[PDB]
Design a protein around this ligand. Structure first.
Ligand SMILES: *[C@@H]1O[C@H](CO)[C@@H](O[C@@H]2O[C@H](CO)[C@@H](O[C@@H]3O[C@H](CO[C@H]4O[C@H](CO)[C@@H](O)[C@H](O[C@H]5O[C@H](CO)[C@@H](O)[C@H](O)[C@@H]5O[C@H]5O[C@H](CO)[C@@H](O)[C@H](O)[C@@H]5O)[C@@H]4O)[C@@H](O)[C@H](O[C@H]4O[C@H](CO)[C@@H](O)[C@H](O)[C@@H]4O[C@H]4O[C@H](CO)[C@@H](O)[C@H](O)[C@@H]4O)[C@@H]3O)[C@H](O)[C@H]2NC(C)=O)[C@H](O)[C@H]1NC(C)=O
Ligand SMILES: *[C@@H]1O[C@H](CO)[C@@H](O[C@@H]2O[C@H](CO)[C@@H](O[C@@H]3O[C@H](CO[C@H]4O[C@H](CO)[C@@H](O)[C@H](O)[C@@H]4O)[C@@H](O)[C@H](O[C@H]4O[C@H](CO)[C@@H](O)[C@H](O)[C@@H]4O[C@H]4O[C@H](CO)[C@@H](O)[C@H](O)[C@@H]4O)[C@@H]3O)[C@H](O)[C@H]2NC(C)=O)[C@H](O)[C@H]1NC(C)=O
Ligand SMILES: *[C@@H]1O[C@H](CO)[C@@H](O[C@@H]2O[C@H](CO)[C@@H](O[C@@H]3O[C@H](CO[C@H]4O[C@H](CO)[C@@H](O)[C@H](O)[C@@H]4O)[C@@H](O)[C@H](O[C@H]4O[C@H](CO)[C@@H](O)[C@H](O)[C@@H]4O)[C@@H]3O)[C@H](O)[C@H]2NC(C)=O)[C@H](O)[C@H]1NC(C)=O
Ligand SMILES: *[C@@H]1O[C@H](CO)[C@@H](O[C@@H]2O[C@H](CO)[C@@H](O[C@@H]3O[C@H](CO)[C@@H](O)[C@H](O[C@H]4O[C@H](CO)[C@@H](O)[C@H](O)[C@@H]4O)[C@@H]3O)[C@H](O)[C@H]2NC(C)=O)[C@H](O)[C@H]1NC(C)=O
Ligand SMILES: *[C@@H]1O[C@H](CO)[C@@H](O[C@@H]2O[C@H](CO)[C@@H](O[C@@H]3O[C@H](CO)[C@@H](O)[C@H](O)[C@@H]3O)[C@H](O)[C@H]2NC(C)=O)[C@H](O)[C@H]1NC(C)=O
Ligand SMILES: *[C@@H]1O[C@H](CO)[C@@H](O[C@@H]2O[C@H](CO)[C@@H](O[C@@H]3O[C@H](CO)[C@@H](O)[C@H](O)[C@@H]3O)[C@H](O)[C@H]2NC(C)=O)[C@H](O)[C@H]1NC(C)=O
Ligand SMILES: *[C@@H]1O[C@H](CO)[C@@H](O[C@@H]2O[C@H](CO)[C@@H](O[C@@H]3O[C@H](CO)[C@@H](O)[C@H](O)[C@@H]3O)[C@H](O)[C@H]2NC(C)=O)[C@H](O)[C@H]1NC(C)=O
Ligand SMILES: *[C@@H]1O[C@H](CO)[C@@H](O[C@@H]2O[C@H](CO)[C@@H](O[C@@H]3O[C@H](CO)[C@@H](O)[C@H](O)[C@@H]3O)[C@H](O)[C@H]2NC(C)=O)[C@H](O)[C@H]1NC(C)=O
Ligand SMILES: *[C@@H]1O[C@H](CO)[C@@H](O[C@@H]2O[C@H](CO)[C@@H](O[C@@H]3O[C@H](CO)[C@@H](O)[C@H](O)[C@@H]3O)[C@H](O)[C@H]2NC(C)=O)[C@H](O)[C@H]1NC(C)=O
Ligand SMILES: *[C@@H]1O[C@H](CO)[C@@H](O[C@@H]2O[C@H](CO)[C@@H](O)[C@H](O)[C@H]2NC(C)=O)[C@H](O)[C@H]1NC(C)=O
Ligand SMILES: *[C@@H]1O[C@H](CO)[C@@H](O[C@@H]2O[C@H](CO)[C@@H](O)[C@H](O)[C@H]2NC(C)=O)[C@H](O)[C@H]1NC(C)=O
Ligand SMILES: *[C@@H]1O[C@H](CO)[C@@H](O[C@@H]2O[C@H](CO)[C@@H](O)[C@H](O)[C@H]2NC(C)=O)[C@H](O)[C@H]1NC(C)=O
Ligand SMILES: *[C@@H]1O[C@H](CO)[C@@H](O[C@@H]2O[C@H](CO)[C@@H](O)[C@H](O)[C@H]2NC(C)=O)[C@H](O)[C@H]1NC(C)=O
Ligand SMILES: *[C@@H]1O[C@H](CO)[C@@H](O)[C@H](O)[C@H]1NC(C)=O
Ligand SMILES: *[C@@H]1O[C@H](CO)[C@@H](O)[C@H](O)[C@H]1NC(C)=O
Ligand SMILES: *[C@@H]1O[C@H](CO)[C@@H](O)[C@H](O)[C@H]1NC(C)=O
Ligand SMILES: *[C@@H]1O[C@H](CO)[C@@H](O)[C@H](O)[C@H]1NC(C)=O
Lengths: 103, 452, 132, 128, 113, 132, 53
């Protein structure tokens, strides 16, 4: 099977800064899909095929990476963008990176 | 001579990838048995009797059968032509009527239906009169709408359906694809060609090989077989939604039949319209079946298990299961045989397990008379019954598989049959081809001038 | 046996051979470019598309200095930033497929230069015959 | 647009069986696959199975076979050829299956694969 | 690739009987000429191989008339009228249209005792 | 801004400019002349009508002395009763629309004279190369 | 007695609209481009063989 390790588990930031979340796989040579899930709502597609944004997604969500290292960078954070982020490759999902307010 | 003056060249061999329409070319030998017997004996050009491929040299072209456009044009052309071979035939609107059905005369055991003896009113040549008439329908074509019971046909809820004229045969004739002017068709020839990537030995050709169009779901029949060894093909093997095509080396043989000696009977629905009904079952009531050789099938599964262990690791437990479920003609094995559509249960082949180190298999078959292939909105057809016991013999060229798996790291890899899209049956015969566009105007430097 | 030379006089056989050897058998790609009720409309539309493509290429070749010539010569010089490779390697080593994907950005510039060259050649010829 | 309406929340007993109806509207339902996925609280996501509604060929996860069945219902009238219904019947319920069940559809792009999930369902809450 | 096989593989035939060996073609062998370019080869041991006949019908000059060949595009065969001692050797079927040129296996006609 | 010169290199932009300035941008009307189930038949019939018109004009231009030339020169003299206007006013003042409606009666005479000129030029060329 | 029409045994038949006349109008055959149509004019032309005019 495919095991996806997703880190950092909890990322505490303030708005305006840049977030970086990296997903490690077991096999290489495939794509990576990045989902946004706010609290108490429906999940949302952000990134498919490791670098392409979904429809209705602003350009501040950038994703890249290759092989095993898969990077998701969110520069210029918003008050709304604080949520949970998942990496899904095929049917094997990640566990979740929570994005928290720092004070 | 340090200066170089630019020169144009018109007619230079250089191509770029493009997509266009391709005109089909059937062989003229089918014209010797003329008069609309099979389709495209009139709507198709005869071939060049001298096909001539031209083997190129030191050339590399990237092939990709999964993003091919020629298979999509073939899937459109067969549907459009198949609809164009039903418009002159009789529409079966007036037969959609309340049926009064009973069991067929048989020592009924209280565990099977499978035949129904249905009497109903029907119009005549004249408009005023009417006639009581009986027929034999299968159980998959009648539905109890709510003494003897009271049924109706299944297509009556949505759409009346044209029956197929028995002058029109269903059997495949080989369809060639001659490229038009300006374009060209390449051909891989590498025996180890995976399906995607560079084929380092190509050959242009003006018109493709013999493609006989079969229609089959679980395992494709009469399909050009590979030469060196049994091969598998996919798009991403670690993906689940994509099928895993398999093409054999040795054609395992299947024999299929229908033992019931029917009697075709003509009923005149209307003036100039005749309806063909199953009149009587003389002989004996015996269920339709298929046979393959058990030893060659065990050997052929041994070959495909030997091939599948490369992509998955040498220590895995490959096992085969029957279909997961769904509609009828994706779980069972669908094909046509002498103009009558079988549906054959294939759980008797797909149960095994495989660890790292004479007889013949019977398998039952069920028959529908109405069919709805390609799943349109309001078009089915009523395949008329055929006189006498029929049987047909076919080589099995390959089969279509499907892997599954959610989680929990087990060493097994259960494979199940597929079907679904009809295009996969064409992607096992247009894999080695690619269409290209000539751009014959190239430009280059050399030392010359033009004299004023 | 047919013979391997029948490959080179065949259609598109020189596609892998060098640029200095495709010019001899360059006329076969020129010749097999042209000749070769819904199905009638599809085949008719494809055939008129092929002859429109051939006529577009003949018109684009005729407004240069070579209306009916397979090989031609012009009067515009090569900017060295186009391909910066000498004569012997682009006529004895490379194939045309590799050459087409090395100058694929600069082609419209070349066509504009050829159009300007033929325009100024026509006005110079008119000025030369005007004095007589 | 593309809409994926589900059925409401449901309360079931251990040993029972639940049926969830994912109605899809806005595209040609006879073309694109439907997937089913479930959010277990404090355990993550887990895939269930896919279904191709042209015929109804389905596949399921390995650790859910013998427990889940999926069917579909096409639309037969030519005046509304677009809408369609998917059905998931999940049997053998335990208190471990208290979760939130989603039906999804593929990305609509010709470049995207099968598992990138653009459109989502509203969310069926299942409490055993 | 258009590889061929040869049925049979060795026939010890007495001096004065008819021998007939067939080669079966996977793909058809038809050129733009129309004539099926197949050649029939004989090789006496330790030598250069000769040519028995041309396409199906024409014959290599310097060969007697104890050789005949037949075929109709798909499967080909020979008929040798009379057997000699020089007819010992290895026979082949050869293709001339598609690349690479394929061969048959090779047959060795022997003696009977 | 695009620029007003892009009018003149545009299609048919020189239609109001003088006759001495339309000859530079004369190739755009030449180039945009060719390229550009009942509806399929209408569009197909219109497209083959356009290419038949272009091929008729190329054949009528090829039987004169200029098969692939936009500008040409001939060997027949102007009868003075045709237009009786000097050179400077018909190449710096007038437009082509006005010129076409001043010689509209005499055009078939001109085409017959050109056909006779090319015929006698061909027989004179054959007589010149016959002696060698 | 009790009759029926004769076409009822095999096929129903479209009647002709009386706006459509049946009378002949002269039909000419113009040859297309590339081809030509010859014409004999010999008054003693048998039907087969050379027409010398
Ligand atoms: C995968 O590929 C395989 C390989 O092709 C497929 O198997 C084929 O399936 C076909 C079904 O579509 C099947 O065709 C049917 O055959 C029936 C059997 O009769 C034929 O065979 C016998 C014995 O082989 C032969 O003797 C007959 O005629 C021979 O001689 C005449 C001379 O007059 C020839 O004209 C004829 O071509 C044939 O020639 C033989 O000899 C020559 C040498 O001289 C050889 O060169 C030939 O190769 C050949 O061996 C029969 O031809 C037959 O009954 C069927 O015909 C009926 O149906 C068709 C419509 O499909 C219709 O056009 C016919 O006219 C006829 O209908 C009429 O009769 C019916 C019965 O009375 C009646 O009900 C109807 O209303 C009509 O009145 C049809 O020809 C074919 O046999 C098999 N192949 C084999 C080897 O068995 C397989 O199907 C493929 N898989 C899939 C999934 O499709
Ligand atoms: C599907 O279902 C339909 C009904 O929905 C069914 O059709 C019916 O089949 C039965 C047979 O199972 C038919 O019944 C027989 O009909 C024949 C023919 O009738 C003609 O002759 C009589 C003579 O008086 C005329 O009046 C009449 O108008 C017809 O012209 C009769 O001959 C049969 O009688 C024999 O069988 C009786 C059974 O009890 C005996 O008692 C009787 O003595 C007769 O036997 C004699 O004749 C036999 C035949 O020669 C011979 O074998 C015996 O030894 C003996 O000499 C019987 O009435 C019925 O008519 C059919 N109905 C219609 C409308 O056609 C299909 O058969 C069924 N098919 C399947 C596959 O299930
Ligand atoms: C059908 O068969 C074709 C072959 O004809 C397959 O296509 C290729 O398959 C190979 C392996 O099967 C793939 O190769 C892998 O590529 C990785 C990416 O590196 C390449 O690309 C970069 C640029 O992106 C180049 O700079 C680099 O040099 C490579 O060219 C490699 O990282 C992989 O390395 C593997 O081996 C090393 C050591 O051997 C290990 O350490 C690695 O972990 C890894 O296992 C490998 O070389 C190649 O990408 C495929 N190409 C394409 C176009 O698909 C098909 O996959 C196959 N398809 C099916 C359905 O069967
Ligand atoms: C026409 O069809 C009928 C269908 O009912 C058929 O009747 C059955 O025939 C069989 C064999 O002739 C009878 O015998 C059965 O088969 C074996 C014989 O050893 C036994 O094992 C069976 O016992 C089981 O079934 C019994 C009844 O269900 C149970 O009581 C018992 O405990 C076992 O479970 C059984 O004896 C069978 O009895 C009849 N059925 C009836 C209802 O009589 C008939 O033979 C067919 N005739 C023709 C001419 O085709
Ligand atoms: C694949 O194989 C499995 C078993 O190997 C098949 O499952 C079997 O399905 C049938 C019905 O489809 C079950 O039959 C039973 O019939 C009786 C009488 O009608 C009814 O009372 C039962 O409720 C049941 O329907 C059978 O028990 C079942 N077997 C098992 C072990 O569950 C499956 O059908 C096969 N797939 C295909 C496509 O054939
Ligand atoms: C798929 O293949 C397996 C074989 O691996 C099939 O299992 C076989 O099932 C039959 C009966 O269904 C067994 O026959 C009898 O079984 C009893 C036990 O109840 C036994 O005591 C008898 O002696 C008799 O053999 C058969 O033994 C069994 N095979 C093995 C190796 O044990 C299975 O039925 C196949 N699936 C389908 C749908 O056919
Ligand atoms: C399915 O594929 C098999 C290949 O395993 C085909 O079997 C072989 O087919 C060829 C030609 O179709 C047969 O050759 C024949 O040889 C006899 C010898 O006298 C000759 O008279 C014939 O004209 C023909 O050349 C070959 O014998 C046959 N092999 C076997 C074992 O039967 C088969 O035809 C394919 N199709 C079907 C429907 O099975
Ligand atoms: C024809 O002209 C275009 C325009 O310059 C050329 O495209 C350029 O190609 C180079 C590669 O040789 C690109 O450089 C690459 O950029 C990416 C950007 O992230 C970088 O990651 C790579 O490491 C590499 O440096 C360049 O960006 C690209 N230009 C543009 C504007 O995208 C093209 O190569 C020319 N054709 C030929 C045959 O030279
Ligand atoms: C091309 O040649 C034709 C043929 O001569 C020219 O047509 C002629 O045009 C003049 C006008 O300039 C006509 O004169 C007018 O006649 C009417 C008759 O009632 C009179 O009422 C007017 O006052 C005026 O005099 C002349 O009749 C006419 N010729 C014929 C035979 O009708 C034409 O003008 C020439 N094209 C050009 C551009 O010059
Ligand atoms: C026709 O076949 C059906 C199906 O077997 C018969 O209907 C029932 O069959 C079951 C056995 O599965 C019996 O237990 C019932 O008693 C049958 N119902 C009746 C009303 O008899 C049916 O009997 C058969 N015959 C007819 C004339 O319909
Ligand atoms: C068309 O008729 C079929 C046959 O009755 C209907 O299918 C059945 O529908 C009922 C209730 O909708 C189900 O309980 C049955 O299981 C269905 N049977 C089959 C074989 O599908 C169908 O609903 C009708 N459709 C329309 C649009 O009227
Ligand atoms: C399928 O049917 C064919 C034709 O009946 C079988 O071929 C014959 O099989 C018998 C033995 O059953 C042999 O004696 C014959 O020599 C075979 N003839 C040919 C031409 O092959 C074939 O065996 C059947 N296949 C299976 C798996 O039963
Ligand atoms: C169609 O109907 C006609 C009219 O009855 C039939 O023609 C008669 O057939 C009978 C017996 O076949 C003959 O005795 C008469 O002489 C025929 N009359 C004429 C005018 O031909 C004809 O047989 C019917 N055809 C079909 C196919 O039903
Ligand atoms: C087929 O034969 C192989 C060889 O022993 C064996 O391992 C396998 O279990 C057999 N399978 C069947 C279905 O007989
Ligand atoms: C797998 O096992 C086969 C045994 O035939 C061997 O040839 C191959 O090299 C092995 N490959 C790996 C990756 O272990
Ligand atoms: C110039 O041409 C010679 C062959 O004539 C070749 O050896 C040399 O490499 C070329 N120079 C360059 C810079 O390519
Ligand atoms: C001749 O040309 C001159 C200009 O070169 C012009 O002024 C004069 O009017 C012309 N003569 C006639 C009769 O048009």
């Amino acid at each position: 099977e495919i095991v996806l390790t997703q880190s950092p588990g909890i990322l505490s930031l303030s708005p305006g800064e840049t977030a970086t979340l990296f997903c490690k796989a077991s096999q290489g040579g495939n794509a990576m899909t990045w989902y946004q899930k706010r609290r108490g709502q429906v999940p949302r597609l952000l990134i498919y095929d490791t670098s392409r944004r979904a429809s209705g997604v602003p350009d501040r969500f950038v994703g890249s990476g290759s092989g095993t290292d898969f990077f998701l960078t969110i520069n210029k954070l918003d008050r709304e963008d604080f949520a949970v982020y998942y990496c899904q490759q095929f049917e094997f999902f990640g566990l979740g990176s929570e994005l928290e307010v720092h004070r | 001579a340090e200066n170089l003056w630019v020169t144009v060249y018109y007619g230079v061999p250089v191509w770029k990838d493009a997509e266009t329409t391709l005109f089909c070319a059937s062989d003229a030998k089918a014209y010797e048995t003329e008069k609309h017997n099979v389709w495209a004996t009139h709507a198709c050009v005869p071939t060049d009797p001298n096909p001539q491929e031209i083997h190129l040299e030191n050339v590399t072209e990237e092939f990709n059968m999964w993003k091919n456009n020629m298979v999509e044009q073939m899937h459109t052309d067969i549907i459009s032509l198949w609809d164009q071979s039903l418009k002159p035939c009789v529409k079966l609107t007036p037969l959609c009527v309340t049926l009064q059905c009973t069991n067929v005369t048989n020592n009924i055991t209280d565990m099977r239906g499978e035949l129904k003896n249905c009497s109903f009113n029907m119009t005549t040549e004249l408009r005023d009169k009417k006639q009581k008439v009986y027929s034999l329908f299968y159980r998959l074509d009648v539905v109890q709408i709510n003494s003897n019971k009271e049924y109706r046909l299944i297509n009556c809820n949505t759409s009346a359906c044209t029956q197929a004229c028995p002058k029109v045969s269903f059997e495949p004739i080989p369809i060639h694809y001659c490229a038009p002017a300006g374009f060209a068709i390449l051909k891989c020839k590498d025996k180890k060609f995976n399906g995607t990537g560079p084929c380092p030995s190509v050959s242009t050709v003006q018109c493709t090989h013999g493609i006989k169009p079969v229609v089959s779901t679980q395992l494709l029949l009469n399909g050009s077989l590979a030469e060196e060894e049994v091969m598998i093909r996919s798009e991403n093997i670690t993906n689940n939604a994509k099928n895993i095509l398999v093409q054999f080396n040795t054609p395992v043989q299947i024999n299929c039949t229908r033992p019931n000696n029917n009697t075709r009977k003509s009923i005149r629905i209307g003036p100039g319209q005749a309806f063909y009904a199953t009149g009587d079952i003389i002989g004996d009531i015996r269920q339709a079946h298929c046979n393959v050789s058990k030893a060659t099938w065990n050997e052929t599964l041994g070959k495909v298990v030997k091939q599948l262990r490369k992509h998955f690791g040498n220590n895995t437990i490959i096992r085969f299961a029957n279909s997961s479920g769904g509609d009828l003609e994706v779980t069972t094995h669908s094909f046509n045989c002498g103009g009558e559509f079988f549906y054959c249960n294939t759980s008797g082949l797909f149960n095994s397990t495989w660890i790292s180190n004479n007889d013949s298999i019977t398998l039952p078959c069920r028959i529908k008379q109405i069919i709805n292939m390609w799943q349109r909105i309001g078009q089915c057809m009523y395949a008329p019954p055929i006189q006498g016991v029929i049987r047909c013999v076919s080589n099995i060229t390959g089969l279509i598989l499907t892997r599954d798996g959610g989680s929990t790291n087990s060493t097994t890899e259960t494979f199940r049959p597929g079907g679904g899209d009809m295009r996969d049956n064409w992607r096992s015969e247009l894999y080695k081809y690619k269409v290209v566009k000539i751009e014959p105007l190239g430009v280059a430097p050399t030392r010359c001038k033009r004299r004023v | 046996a047919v013979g391997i030379g029948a490959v080179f006089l065949g259609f598109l056989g020189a596609a892998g051979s060098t640029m200095g050897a495709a010019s001899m058998t360059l006329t076969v790609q020129a010749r097999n470019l042209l000749s070769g009720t819904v199905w009638g409309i599809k085949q008719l539309q494809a055939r008129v598309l092929a002859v429109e493509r051939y006529l577009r290429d003949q018109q684009l070749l005729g407004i240069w200095g070579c209306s009916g010539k397979l090989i031609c010569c012009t009067n515009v010089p090569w900017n060295s930033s186009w391909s910066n490779r000498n004569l012997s390697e682009i006529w004895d080593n490379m194939t045309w497929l590799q050459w087409d994907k090395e100058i694929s950005n600069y082609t419209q510039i070349i066509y504009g230069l050829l159009e300007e060259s033929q325009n100024q050649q026509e006005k110079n010829e008119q000025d030369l015959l005007a004095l007589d | 647009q593309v809409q994926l309406v589900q059925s409401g929340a449901v309360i079931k007993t251990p040993g029972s069986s639940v049926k969830i109806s994912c109605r899809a509207s806005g595209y040609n339902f006879r073309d694109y696959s439907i997937h089913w996925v479930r959010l277990i609280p404090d355990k993550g996501f887990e895939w269930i199975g896919w279904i191709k509604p042209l015929w109804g060929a389905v596949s399921y996860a390995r650790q859910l076979q013998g427990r889940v069945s999926m069917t579909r219902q096409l639309s037969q009238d030519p005046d509304d050829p677009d809408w369609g219904v998917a059905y998931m019947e999940f049997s053998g319920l335990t208190p471990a299956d208290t979760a939130e069940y989603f039906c999804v559809r593929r990305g609509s792009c010709d470049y995207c694969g099968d598992f990138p999930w653009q459109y989502w369902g509203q969310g069926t809450v299942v409490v055993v | 690739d258009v590889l061929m096989t040869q049925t049979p593989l060795s026939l010890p035939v007495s001096l004065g009987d008819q021998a007939s060996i067939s080669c079966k073609s996977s793909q058809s062998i038809v050129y733009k000429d129309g004539n099926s370019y197949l050649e029939w080869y004989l090789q006496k041991v330790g030598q250069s191989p000769k040519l028995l006949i041309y396409r199906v019908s024409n014959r290599f000059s310097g060969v007697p008339d104890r050789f005949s060949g037949s075929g109709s595009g798909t499967d080909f065969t020979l008929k040798i009228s009379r057997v000699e001692a020089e007819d010992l050797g290895v026979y082949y079927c050869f293709q001339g249209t598609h690349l690479p040129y394929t061969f048959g296996g090779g047959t060795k006609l022997e003696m009977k005792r």
